[PDB]
Design an enzyme around this catalytic site. Structure first.
Site, PDB file in Angstrom:
ATOM      1  CE1 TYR A  57       1.135  -0.329   4.390  1.00  0.00           C
ATOM      2  CE2 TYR A  57       0.452   1.854   4.211  1.00  0.00           C
ATOM      3  CZ  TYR A  57       1.077   0.934   4.882  1.00  0.00           C
ATOM      4  OH  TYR A  57       1.617   1.517   6.063  1.00  0.00           O
ATOM      5  CG  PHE A  87       0.072   9.533   5.058  1.00  0.00           C
ATOM      6  CD1 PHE A  87       0.036   8.403   6.015  1.00  0.00           C
ATOM      7  CD2 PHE A  87      -0.733   9.643   4.131  1.00  0.00           C
ATOM      8  CE1 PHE A  87      -0.883   7.557   5.952  1.00  0.00           C
ATOM      9  CE2 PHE A  87      -1.989   8.752   3.903  1.00  0.00           C
ATOM     10  CZ  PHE A  87      -2.145   7.839   4.952  1.00  0.00           C
ATOM     11  CG  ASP A  88       2.658   4.431   5.860  1.00  0.00           C
ATOM     12  OD1 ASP A  88       3.594   3.959   5.802  1.00  0.00           O
ATOM     13  OD2 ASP A  88       1.833   3.539   6.577  1.00  0.00           O
ATOM     14  CB  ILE A 125      -7.745   2.761   9.871  1.00  0.00           C
ATOM     15  CG1 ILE A 125      -7.053   2.669   8.630  1.00  0.00           C
ATOM     16  CG2 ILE A 125      -6.712   3.616  10.872  1.00  0.00           C
ATOM     17  CD1 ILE A 125      -6.697   3.952   7.808  1.00  0.00           C
ATOM     18  CE1 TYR A 133      -4.623   6.236  13.115  1.00  0.00           C
ATOM     19  CE2 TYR A 133      -4.102   7.038  10.824  1.00  0.00           C
ATOM     20  CZ  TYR A 133      -3.802   6.148  12.012  1.00  0.00           C
ATOM     21  OH  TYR A 133      -3.049   5.212  12.130  1.00  0.00           O
ATOM     22  CG  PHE A 137      -4.853   3.772   2.072  1.00  0.00           C
ATOM     23  CD1 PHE A 137      -3.481   3.929   2.635  1.00  0.00           C
ATOM     24  CD2 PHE A 137      -5.906   4.158   2.801  1.00  0.00           C
ATOM     25  CE1 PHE A 137      -3.518   4.368   3.916  1.00  0.00           C
ATOM     26  CE2 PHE A 137      -5.713   4.796   3.952  1.00  0.00           C
ATOM     27  CZ  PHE A 137      -4.609   4.694   4.530  1.00  0.00           C
TER      28      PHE A 137
END
Lengths: 331, 444, 385, 107, 255
Positions: free
Chosen positions: D26, D36-37, D56, D82, D99
């Site tokens: 992902y 961010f990730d 999540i 979140y 994502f």
């Protein structure tokens, strides 16, 4: 685990190999100077750089003389590189004297005397291993009454007008210890009860006799050879804002140590036999008092009339009276 | 030539650099010469390493790893400012170590690792942060003091190592004295543990420390407890709660292994008589009533709710009558333990005779006899059959009379049949009779 | 002047204050670096003695009072209206000199920085004011560097005020230095300050410069220029194809770029218009190119999801048919023969158009331009050439 | 509250069952396009066992709607993301998360 | 970012931003380190470490950021445990001898059986999709094998290139070329990730003649700047510490 600790105490610590002279000789050598052929101002050699580092650290303003293992180790190394020490020939003795002079020159040609003065001044009257190492290094470079070292020390003190040096000297004298009947009697009670002395000798009685002897020997070596300049400057520092009477401080410490010696005399007068611990304490205290008497004699010989008058008006006579009593009875 | 050895290579490299250039970085100069001295002091490396070398068997490896991890966490928390999260983390770490078995089985390993020094550093940080004002994070101070008390109790060498920190703990002796359940979690408690039942350390105790403790006791006897009066307690003119703590520390200082240390006892007696306010309002010696009167007034205070409580186990409610009782009892116990030995008295030592006479002048025999003659409150059976049991923490207790008896035996002693029979009739026999009457199944 | 006494009646020693402030700054000037160690230490000792004497006589509070009473006026013009136009000229210089004097008084002195901790909150309240921002920042930096006790007073509001100074005044590295001093002091970390600075500065991603690894993207085109103009010999409808022999979706951690379509020059220059010569930008990343990537139509660096039968990112064995019609400006695509129900239209047709493919590493593609330059896999739409 | 778009299709038959571990790659972006990730950055496939509240829930069911070998775009609103609190230091409050997720394996 | 060689203001602000990242993640703030892993990721760190045209200030800042995010916590833990020797009495422990063989020649420092207890090295996976908080213990993961290989390769290249005293050192100066690389190297050596052949190649790079396993010119002979000399002093200090530890373990084995 017990074997590891005992082995460390008995073999590793007792191992002694002598390297100080060779290390100092290596550090005093310039390195390939004609090969880099700069031919400018000569660079300071490694020993000079190390002494400059110590001097700068001493000269840096601080509220306390910070304990430094590097300074302690290298001060010990430099001190041991100087002395390097039945009857001897005149030629052998003269060669020994010249060798000692050369070894002291190796250090005092690179700022060692100024460094030890700066370290003593930065001590600010607080006793410690730093001050002990500094005094030992000063004694090592002043042994034999080194006139050049004395002149360098006096010139540095007069140029810098270092009142802190003399204030620290007075503080160290005040902090010097004497015989302690309370500690001695508590130790005797502990031995009677039978607890094992974890420290080798229970040395708390007369805490730092080696340090006291080193301090007063350094003071004597400052005036060795009837050096009128120091034997007047120690009494009064003309160019400084404040003045500390080192002669009076020395005679005050002599009074204190005489009182302690009298205390042990009065303690042991009734008893038939003097214990081994008490005899050791007498030996150490007598050594300290002997060093103090030698320091006063060096203060006043080569007649220094100012020092003579100061001692005449000081409390020297009371200490002499007490010593005379102790001698006349212990004889 | 080829160095063939890291030692020779390093020596040559440092010397070559130093003679090649004038190094302008003092840190670089220091590192170079430290490395060179290491090369020439290979013995010193072992001299420094063997004391910090410890061996363990295979079965202790996992517990040692866990203990080292906890010690690493505690050491790492020295590099961060203390807060709530850091307080929780170090409390957990100290608990983990205290629950670890290697901590008990290998005290020498802990001393070599210098755990006591780390915990003392943390306690110093916490106390110095707001030493003048209210102590922030008191629970850290409590946990650190409890850990150091356990460390002292593990072994004598640990006790001797902690004894070197006596001066700081005495200067910080008044951190949590007033708070109950803080018992055993104070720097004064750590100092007491550093001397408890150790004749060598009790003898190594010196006069200035005892003078510090006596000064604190005099302050307690002259002034009230500001926190207690801020929490509503009536403003009496003195501080029995803290006075008792200081008296207990002096008791541990003067009494060791069931025998009185004569030097410490004499010094403490001299300091106490030089500062007479240390003895409390009854024994002030100017307009104050007797010890029996003080006990009776404390009884009246304890059974009067208004004078006892704040009136806006102990928690906020410190029973002031019991506090006064315990203060006077601790003072009498300390004096009785400071009393000289009967063999010294028989030998006729002037110092022992003088100290005994001083204690006799301080405490009349009639006061002790009367306080012993004071009766107890008794557990009764209600009409329902359940036991109506008084709260001993808020009233007169047998330990006070035990201290009374200790002083009476050590200072005065029982040597005549008339006095023995009188004391037995007035103070001892009623207590034995009450204890015998308390021999029912429920009341025992 | 605040009480509204006549301006001529009361006198402000403006020149005397300026001269005395300059003299005080020179008096508290730190020693120069090139001096010998002994002289430098003597100068430092003298400076510390001067700072201690000034603190003991309470000169810092007097300087703070002067600063506070000068701050009641928002600008030099306001001070000139109230107190005279010469005073208006000297107002900003006197404020700067006062802040510099405060910083010199407290710099390097632990006791003075600790005593300034109580007033530290008052200092931060005027960070936003442009006339005093730099001086307040310097004083705050000195205080935070020297005194841990003063660091203990900084809270979330103060940290947010500093971050707002960053937000409203631009990129100033002295603010970052102040935040670093807040984070760490004398080798001791403040977890609260670290957490606050992190959580209040990083997630926004609107102030600090953002870094990312980007795949290099290159563009390939035929040497064909298509345009439309009044009275020109140019045809208006064109067609070509691209066949993807191979593509690897992830050569690196970033997705492989592969876009196909048309691009336009600026005017009649042969150079592609309004794009970067090198970088990560491909077809559709400006308003001169028009691209298709299998799922999106790209124009102006903006993607728009477009539907197609069995829509997917361009993969192996995909044939993309690109149609350009300059009669009514339109760009259309066909994926594997199926139409893609999205179009580019009404774009600028004052420049020359050409086929274009943009790609990162990991592709094998084949231009099919018709005739002897690649046989079409599908019949071109009627009219298109 | 999760919107799924296909990027590259899967088999279309094999889906995550309860008590099964999904192994994915992902890449996470904020709604403005800022990454961010990413698991591909760390070169480690991300494994999560479905139904046990490990990730999540937007990512959870958006992966659950995916077939084996499939690549997809997952849009998760803040309620499934979140949310109002956000994730301190990385995710601002009330942030929509995109994502790019590929189901490598089921185990 | 390579244009920041010529945008000075952006370069200064970004260097201070990297310093702020280091400050916020300083001294074991694992949560902040995990948060920073989102803003400066592993590919970015590797690219900044390896790139030869990187501005010197940014190169130093990114080396520091990598060390502070991924390496400093365990490095500091091992350094705290460095001067303590807890040696379990196992068969492995009884196996150690002072010298490898009858020819009493020193073994290569750091190479050999070591049995003294050391802190356990653990790392957590950075993942912002996961909602578990256990990852907030331990520093974020980094590829240590890749880091070792790259550090060795760039150190070899720097030793070969700087020996020629080239006019274009990486970062603009010899300091910018060597200080961050040697710092990252020293951090890895402190953690003890290097083993066997890697450590042998490293010792040959430091000094080929002395560390020849039983022409080439090592780092100690290269006329280094003063910060580089300080870093080399730290390195030789660690080597001496390794020798002392081996001596202690062998003493226990004999005991």
């Amino acid at each position: 685990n017990l074997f590891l600790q005992g082995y460390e105490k008995s073999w590793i610590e007792t191992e002694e190999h002598y390297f100080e002279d060779k290390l100092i000789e290596d550090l005093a050598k310039p390195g390939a100077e004609p090969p880099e052929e700069d031919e400018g101002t000569k660079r300071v050699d490694p020993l000079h750089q190390l002494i400059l580092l110590f001097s700068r650290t001493a000269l840096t303003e601080k509220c306390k003389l910070e304990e430094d293992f590097l300074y302690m180790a290298y001060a010990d190394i430099m001190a041991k590189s100087c002395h390097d020490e039945e009857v001897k020939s005149f030629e052998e003795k003269e060669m020994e004297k010249q060798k000692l002079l050369y070894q002291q020159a190796r250090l005092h040609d690179r700022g060692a005397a100024e460094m030890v003065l700066q370290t003593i001044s930065a001590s600010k009257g607080e006793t410690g291993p730093m001050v002990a190492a500094t005094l030992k290094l000063g004694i090592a470079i002043l042994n034999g009454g080194n006139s050049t070292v004395q002149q360098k020390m006096l010139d540095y003190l007069k140029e810098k007008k270092d009142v802190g040096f003399f204030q620290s000297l007075a503080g160290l004298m005040q902090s010097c210890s004497v015989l302690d009947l309370n500690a001695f009697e508590r130790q005797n009670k502990a031995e009677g009860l039978g607890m094992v002395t974890e420290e080798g000798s229970g040395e708390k009685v007369l805490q730092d006799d080696e340090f006291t002897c080193d301090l007063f020997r350094f003071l004597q070596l400052l005036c060795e050879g009837h050096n009128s300049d120091f034997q007047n400057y120690l009494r009064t520092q003309t160019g400084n804002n404040t003045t500390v009477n080192i002669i009076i401080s020395t005679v005050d410490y002599l009074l204190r140590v005489q009182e302690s010696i009298s205390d042990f005399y009065w303690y042991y007068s009734g008893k038939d036999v003097i214990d081994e611990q008490g005899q050791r304490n007498f030996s150490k205290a007598i050594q300290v008092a002997k060093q103090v008497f030698n320091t006063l004699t060096e203060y006043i010989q080569g007649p220094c009339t100012g020092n003579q008058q100061s001692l005449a008006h000081s409390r020297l006579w009371d200490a002499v009276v007490g010593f005379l009593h102790v001698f006349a009875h212990m004889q | 030539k080829k160095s063939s050895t890291l030692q020779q290579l390093i020596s040559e490299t440092m010397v070559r650099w130093a003679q090649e250039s004038v190094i302008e970085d003092p840190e670089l100069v220091r590192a170079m010469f430290v490395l060179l001295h290491r090369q020439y002091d290979g013995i010193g490396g072992l001299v420094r390493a063997l004391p910090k070398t410890y061996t363990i068997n295979g079965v202790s490896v996992e517990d040692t790893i866990n203990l080292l991890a906890s010690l690493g966490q505690i050491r790492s928390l020295l590099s961060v400012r203390m807060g709530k999260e850091e307080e929780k983390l170090m409390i957990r770490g100290l608990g983990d170590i205290m629950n670890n078995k290697v901590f008990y089985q290998h005290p020498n390993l802990m001393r070599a690792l210098g755990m006591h020094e780390t915990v003392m550093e943390v306690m110093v940080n916490v106390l110095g942060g707001g030493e003048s004002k209210e102590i922030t994070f008191p629970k850290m101070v409590a946990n650190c003091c409890r850990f150091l008390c356990y460390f002292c109790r593990i072994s004598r060498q640990n006790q001797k190592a902690m004894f070197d920190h006596l001066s700081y703990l005495l200067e910080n002796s008044s951190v949590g004295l007033a708070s109950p359940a803080m018992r055993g979690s104070t720097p004064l408690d750590v100092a007491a543990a550093s001397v408890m039942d150790n004749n060598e350390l009790a003898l190594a105790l010196r006069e200035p420390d005892l003078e510090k403790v006596v000064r604190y006791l005099a302050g307690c006897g002259l002034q009230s407890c500001q926190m207690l009066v801020s929490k509503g307690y009536p403003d009496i003119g003195w501080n029995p709660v803290e006075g008792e703590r200081y008296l207990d520390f002096l008791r541990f200082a003067v009494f060791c292994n069931g025998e009185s240390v004569e030097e410490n006892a004499n010094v403490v007696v001299r300091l106490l008589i030089r500062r007479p306010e240390c003895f409390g309002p009854a024994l002030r010696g100017e307009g104050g009533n007797g010890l029996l009167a003080a006990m009776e007034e404390a009884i009246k205070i304890a059974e009067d709710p208004s004078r006892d409580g704040p009136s806006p186990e102990e928690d906020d409610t410190i029973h002031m009558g019991n506090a006064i009782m315990t203060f006077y009892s601790a003072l009498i116990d300390l004096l009785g333990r400071c009393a000289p030995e009967m063999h010294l008295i028989h030998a006729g030592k002037g110092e022992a005779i003088r100290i005994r006479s001083i204690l006799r002048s301080l405490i009349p025999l009639g006061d002790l006899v009367g306080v012993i003659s004071i009766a107890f409150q008794m557990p009764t059976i209600a009409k329902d059959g359940n036991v109506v049991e008084p709260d001993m923490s808020a009233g007169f207790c047998p330990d006070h009379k035990a201290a009374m008896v200790l002083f009476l035996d050590s200072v005065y002693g029982i040597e005549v049949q008339d006095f023995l029979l009188h004391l037995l009739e007035v103070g001892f026999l009623p207590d034995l009779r009450a204890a015998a009457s308390l021999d029912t199944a429920a009341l025992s | 002047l605040s009480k509204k006494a006549k301006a001529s009646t009361v006198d402000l020693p403006i020149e005397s204050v300026s001269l005395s402030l300059q003299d005080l700054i020179g008096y508290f000037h730190p020693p120069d670096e090139h001096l010998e160690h002994e002289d430098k230490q003597n100068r430092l000792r003298a400076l510390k003695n001067r700072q201690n004497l000034f603190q003991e006589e309470g000169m810092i509070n007097l300087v703070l009072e002067c600063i506070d009473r000068l701050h009641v006026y928002s600008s030099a013009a306001h001070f000139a209206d109230v107190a005279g136009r010469e005073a208006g000229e000297s107002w900003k210089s006197i404020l700067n000199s006062l802040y510099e004097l405060l910083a010199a008084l407290i710099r390097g002195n632990r006791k003075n920085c600790a005593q300034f901790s109580g007033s530290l909150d008052w200092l931060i309240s005027r960070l936003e004011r442009l006339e005093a921002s730099s001086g307040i920042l310097e004083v705050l930096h000195c205080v935070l560097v020297e005194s841990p006790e003063a660091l203990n007073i900084i809270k979330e509001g103060h940290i947010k005020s500093i971050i707002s100074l960053l937000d409203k005044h631009g990129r100033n590295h002295k603010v970052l230095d102040v935040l670093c001093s807040l984070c760490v002091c004398h080798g001791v970390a403040v977890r609260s300050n670290q957490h606050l600075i992190c959580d209040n500065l990083l997630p926004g991603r609107d102030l600090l410069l953002q870094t990312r690894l980007v795949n290099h993207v290159s563009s390939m085109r035929p040497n064909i220029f298509l345009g439309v103009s009044e009275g020109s010999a140019q045809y208006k409808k064109w067609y070509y194809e691209l066949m993807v022999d191979h593509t690897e979706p992830f050569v690196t951690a970033e997705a492989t770029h592969l876009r196909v379509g048309w691009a336009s020059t600026e005017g009649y220059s042969p150079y592609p218009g309004g794009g970067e010569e090198w970088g990560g930008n491909g077809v559709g990343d400006d308003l001169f190119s028009y691209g298709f990537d299998g799922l999106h139509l790209w124009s102006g660096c903006i993607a728009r999801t477009v539907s197609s039968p069995n829509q997917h990112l361009l993969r192996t064995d995909d044939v993309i048919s690109c149609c350009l019609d300059l009669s009514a400006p339109s760009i259309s695509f066909r994926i594997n023969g199926q139409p893609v129900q999205g179009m580019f239209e009404n774009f600028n047709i004052d420049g020359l158009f050409f086929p274009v493919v943009s790609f990162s590493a990991g592709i094998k593609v084949r231009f099919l331009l018709g005739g002897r330059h690649g046989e079409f896999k599908f019949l071109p739409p009627p009219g298109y050439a | 509250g999760v919107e799924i778009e296909t990027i590259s299709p899967g088999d279309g038959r094999t889906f995550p069952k309860k008590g099964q571990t999904c192994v994915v790659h992902y890449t996470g972006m904020l709604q403005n396009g800022k990454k961010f990730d990413s698991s591909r950055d760390r070169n480690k496939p991300f494994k999560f066992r479905i139904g046990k509240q490990e990730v999540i829930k937007g990512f959870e069911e958006g992966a659950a709607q995916m077939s084996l070998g499939q690549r997809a775009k997952l849009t998760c609103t803040p309620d499934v993301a979140y949310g109002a609190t956000g994730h301190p230091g990385v995710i601002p409050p009330n942030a929509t998360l995109i994502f790019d997720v590929e189901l490598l394996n089921l185990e | 970012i390579l244009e920041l060689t010529e945008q000075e203001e952006l370069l200064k602000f970004h260097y201070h931003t990297l310093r702020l990242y280091s400050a916020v993640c300083a001294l074991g703030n694992h949560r902040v380190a995990h948060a920073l892993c989102s803003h400066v990721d592993e590919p970015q760190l590797l690219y900044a470490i390896e790139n030869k045209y990187m501005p010197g200030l940014l190169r130093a800042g990114y080396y520091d950021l990598l060390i502070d995010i991924h390496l400093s916590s365990y490095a500091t833990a091992r350094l705290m445990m460095n001067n303590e020797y807890i040696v379990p009495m196992t068969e492995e422990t009884k196996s150690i001898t002072l010298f490898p063989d009858e020819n009493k020649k020193h073994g290569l420092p750091g190479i050999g059986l070591s049995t003294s207890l050391r802190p356990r090295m653990q790392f957590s996976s950075p993942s912002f999709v996961s909602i578990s908080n256990e990852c907030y213990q331990y520093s974020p993961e980094f590829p240590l094998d890749i880091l070792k290989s790259k550090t060795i390769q760039m150190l070899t290249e720097a030793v070969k290139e700087g020996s020629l005293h080239a006019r274009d050192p990486v970062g603009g100066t010899t300091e910018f070329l060597f200080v961050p690389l040697i710092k990252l190297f020293y951090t890895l050596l402190i953690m003890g990730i290097f083993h066997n052949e890697d450590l042998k190649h490293i010792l040959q790079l430091i000094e080929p003649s002395v560390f020849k396993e039983a022409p080439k010119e090592g780092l100690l002979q290269m006329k280094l700047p003063e910060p580089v000399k300080l870093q080399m002093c730290l390195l030789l200090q660690y080597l001496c510490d390794c020798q002392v530890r081996h001596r202690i373990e062998a003493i226990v084995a004999f005991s």
